[PDB]
Amino acid sequence: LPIRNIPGNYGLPIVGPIKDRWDYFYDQGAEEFFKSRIRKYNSTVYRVNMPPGAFIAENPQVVALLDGKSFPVLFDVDKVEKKDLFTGTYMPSTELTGGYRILSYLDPSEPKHEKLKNLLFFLLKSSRNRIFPEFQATYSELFDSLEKELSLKGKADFGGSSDGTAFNFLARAFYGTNPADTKLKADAPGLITKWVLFNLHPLLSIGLPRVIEEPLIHTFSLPPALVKSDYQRLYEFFLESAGEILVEADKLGISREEATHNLLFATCFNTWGGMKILFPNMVKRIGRAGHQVHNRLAEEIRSVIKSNGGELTMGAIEKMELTKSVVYECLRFEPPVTAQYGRAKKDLVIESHDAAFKVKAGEMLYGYQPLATRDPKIFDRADEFVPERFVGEEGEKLLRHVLWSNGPETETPTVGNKQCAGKDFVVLVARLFVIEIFRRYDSFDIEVGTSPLGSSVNFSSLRKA
Ligand code: HEM
Ligand SMILES: CCCCC[C@H](O)/C=C/C=C\CCCCCCCC(=O)O
C-alpha cells in the first residue's frame, strides 16, 4: 500500500478543540462528526480533537482509526500502551475509587493487572452455577413489573425498572446476596448512577442546552467529595457481601481493601453500567427487527427448551442459532462502548484499506468502534441489522470482526491483554435476556428515545405466549 500523510488538523489553540467539541456533542453528534470528516479527508484515518479538552484533559489531539483493518492495532499490547486511558485523554480522580488505580486503568506490564484480572476470572467462574437460576428469577420479576406498568399506563419504561433488576441479579449471582436484605435496600442504582456521572460527565451530554452543559459538565471535573458518602455505602456492601471472593483475593496476594474497590468497580461500573447500555439497545434493535423475527426467535427458543426437557442449560443455548446470531448482531451493529484508546509505544505503520500511515511513538490512537464494525469493506449489508448474519459456518467466521470486548470475538481475554474480563459472561447474559423475552412473549412493540449513555425504551405491547 502507498504511504499517505495522515490528513486532518487540530485548528487553533483553545478554539479548535472547542469547535470540534460542539460538533461532537451538539451540531453533528458522534457518528456524523466522524463520517463527515471521513468524507472531507477521503480517509478512515485522520487527525482530530476529542472531548473533553478544556481543563479536564491535557491534550485532546488523537489519530482516529475508523475502519476494521486499522482499528485492531488498538488491541496489540506490543504496539500500544494501555495505561490510564480507559476513559480516553483524561482519567477520573483516584479519589473516586478509594485512592487506587483500578484494574481497568492498568497496563498489562503492571503486576497487579495480572492479579486483579485473575480475581475477576475467579469471581465469574465461581458464579457459574448461580447465573441461570438467579437471572431467571430476577428477570421474571422484571417482566411481571413491566406487564403491571403496561396495564396501568399503556406503556412500560424499561430502563427505570431494569436497572434495579440488573443490580439485584449481580448481587445474587456473584455474591449470593439479595440487596433487599442489606442496608443498600433498593438504593444501588441511584448511588451507582451518580458515581458513574462523576466519572464520565466530560464525555456525555444530558440534553441540557450547551450554554448550561458546557460550563457545568464539559469544562471542569465535578468534585469527588460530593459522591464520597454514596460510594461508601457501596463499599460497605461489597466489603460485607464479598466474603468468599475476598478469600481468593487473599490467596492471589491482593489486599482486602484493594480487592474490595476493584470488585465494586467491576460489578458497578464495568458490569452493571455495561448492562445498562446494552440491554435497552438490544430491546430497541430486536424490536425494530419486526414481528416475523420475534416469532422465529420464539419458535426456536421454545422448541429448543422443549427438546431439552424444559431445562435451560449452556448446551441448549448452543442449539439456538438465530438467538446466538441476533446477540452477536446487536454487539456488531451497536457496540455498547464506542471509544477505545491506545498510545503508540514505538513508531508504527498502520495499514488501512487503501493506504498505510506512519505514527510516531507517543501519539494517542483512538478508534470509534461502530465504524470498524459497520465497515462495508468487511461486512455486506453493513448498515443493516441482519438477525441471521452469524448463522452457519461462514457466518461464524465473521465473528473475528465483532469487537465489542476490545478484541476479536473469536479471541479470549487473558492476563496478557486488555480484552474485557467478562467477555463470556456478557455474551451469556445477553443470550439469557433474549431467551427470557421470547419464552414469555410472541412479539412486542417499543417506543424509543435518547439517553445520556445508550437508549431509553418503553414497551407499548407485550404479546404473551
Ligand atoms: C455489557 C457489559 C460490558 C461491556 C459493554 C463491556 C465492555 C468493555 C470494554 C469496551 C472494555 C475495554 C476498555 C478499554 O478501552 O481498555 C472492557 C474492559 C474490561 N472489562 Fe468489560 N464490559 C462489560 C462487562 C464486564 C463484566 C461482566 C466484567 C466482569 C469482570 C467486566 C470487566 C472488565 C475489566 C476488568 C476490563 C479491563 C480489562 C483489563 O484491564 O485487562 N466487563 N469492557
Ligand atoms: C457506564 C459505562 C459502563 C461501561 C463499562 C465497560 O466495561 C467499559 C467502558 C470502557 C470505557 C469507559 C468509557 C465508557 C463511556 C461510555 C459512553 C460513551 C462511549 O460509548 O464511549
Question: For residue 464, what are the CA distances in angstroms to 282, 298, 438, 442?
Answer: 19, 11, 9, 6
Inter-residue contact 48 to 11 (CB < 8 Å): no
Q: Whose CA is nearest to atom 15 of ligand 2?
A: 337
If you count DSSP H runs as helices and E runs as strands, how many of each does the chain have, helices first?
Answer: 17, 10
Cα–Cα distance list, 205 to 26, 174, 455 (Å)? 9, 32, 13
Contact between 204 and 453 (Cβ < 8 Å) = yes
Distance CA 136, CA 60 (A): 44
356-366 CB burial, b ≥16 within 10 A, e <16? ebebeeebbbb
Ligand nearest 204 Cα, by number?
2
Q: How far apart are CA 308 and CA 323, in angstroms?
A: 16
**Strands 364-368 vs 61-65: parallel, antiparallel or unpaired:** parallel
Q: What is the Cα–Cα distance from 259 to 448, expressed in whole angstroms? A: 39
Which of 364, 359, 338 lies closest to 348, judged by CA?
359
- Nearest CA owner, ligand 1 atom 13: 86
Measured between alpha carbons, how far is residue 462 from residues 120, 270, 387, 458 in Å? Answer: 37, 30, 20, 11
Structural contact between residues 373 and 44, judged by C-beta atoms closer than 8 angstroms: no
Neighbouring residues of 293: CB distance < 8 A, sequence distance ≥ 6: 286, 326, 387
User: How far, CA to CA in Å, does 330 sit from each of 19, 125, 151, 335?
Assistant: 32, 25, 29, 8
Experiment type: X-ray
Per-residue CA distances from 142 to 175, 263, 376, 436 (Å): 20, 25, 38, 10
Distance from the CA of 205 to the center of ligand 2, in angstroms?
A: 14
> Which residue do the cell numbers 445520556 mark?
452
Q: Which three cell numbers stand for residue 238?
A: 461489597
Which ligand has an atom closest to residue 270 CA?
A: 2
CATH number at residue 237: 1.10.630.10
Quote the DSSP letter at residue 221.
P
Alpha helices, DSSP H, located in 228-320: 228-241, 243-251, 256-265, 274-289, 291-307, 314-318
Judge whether 446 and 460 are in contact, CB under 8 Å.
yes
In contact, 413 and 421? CB cutoff 8 Å: yes
- Calpha distance 353→44 (Å, rounded): 9
Between β-strands 339-344 and 80-81, what pairing exists: parallel, antiparallel or unpaired? Answer: antiparallel
**Host H or E run for residue 394:** helix 392-397
The neighbouring-strand residues paired with 462 are 444
CA-nearest of 259, 266, 264 to 245 is 259
DSSP class of residue 16 equals H
Nearest CA to ligand 2 atom 8: 270
Question: Resolution, rounded to a tenth of an Å?
Answer: 1.9
Alpha-carbon dihedral 209, 215, 221, 225, rounded to 10 degrees: -90
| 366's grid cell | 483512538
Angle of helix 291-307 relative to helix 321-333, nearest 10 degrees, comes to 130
Annotated binding site: 82, 113, 117, 270, 338, 418, 420
Q: Print the domain residue range for 364.
A: 1-465
Whole-angstrom distance, CA of residue 68 vs CA of residue 371: 7
Strand pairing partners for 62?
48
Q: Cβ of 292: how many Cβ atoms within 10 Å?
A: 10
Q: Which helix (H) or strand (E) holds 372?
A: helix 369-373
Q: Which helix (H) or strand (E) holds 462?
A: strand 455-464
- Residues 280 and 196: their CA atoms lie apart, in Å, by 18
The HSE-up count of residue 124 (CA atoms within 13 Å, CB side) is 20
Ligand 2 site, residue 196, Cβ cutoff 6 A: yes
Instruction: Dihedral sign for Cα 37, 40, 46, 48, please.
Output: negative
Residue type, 258: E
Question: Which among 169, 42, 188, 140 has a CA at the least distance from the CA of 441?
Answer: 140
Dist. CA 123–CA 170, nearest whole Å = 11
Residue with the nearest Cα to atom 13 of ligand 2?
87
Q: Is 268 in the pocket of ligand 1 (CB under 6 A)?
A: no
DSSP code string of 293-317: HHHHHHHHHHHHHHHTTT---HHHH
**Residue 444 three-state SS:** strand
Helix ranges, 127-203 (H): 131-153, 159-175, 188-200
Q: Which of 85, 206, 337 to mutate to test the pocket of ligand 2 (most atoms within 8 A of CB)?
A: 337
Determine contact, residues 252/118, Cβ cutoff 8 Å. yes
b/e per residue, 247-278, with b = 16+ CB within 10 A? ebbeeeebeeebbbbbbbbbbbbbbbbbbbbb
- β-bridge mates for residue 309, sequence order: none
Those residues with Cβ within 8 angstroms of residue 431's Cβ, 6 or more apart along the chain or in another chain: 317, 320, 323, 324, 327
For β-strands 455-464 and 441-450, DSSP reports them as antiparallel
Based on the number of CB atoms within 10 Å of its own CB, is 135 exposed (0-12), middle (13-18) or buried (19 or more)? Answer: buried
d(CA 143, CA 162): 9
Beta carbons within 8 Å of 379's beta carbon, 6+ residues apart: 332, 373, 389, 398, 401
- Please state whether the peptide bond connecting residue 17 to the residue before it is cis, i.e. omega within 30 degrees of 0: no
C-alpha cell at 193: 448512577
Other beta carbons within 10 angstroms of residue 392's beta carbon come to 11
Local structure of 406: helix, strand or coil: coil
DSSP state letter for 352:
-
Which ligand is closest to the CA of 366, given by its number? 1
166 DSSP assignment: H
Could you give the angle at the alpha carbon of 226 between the alpha carbons of 225 and 228, nearest 5°? 60
The structural domain count of the chain equals 1
CA atoms of 111 and 118, how far apart (whole Å): 11
Residues in the chain: 465
Question: How many Cβ atoms sit within 10 Å of the Cβ of residue 199?
Answer: 22
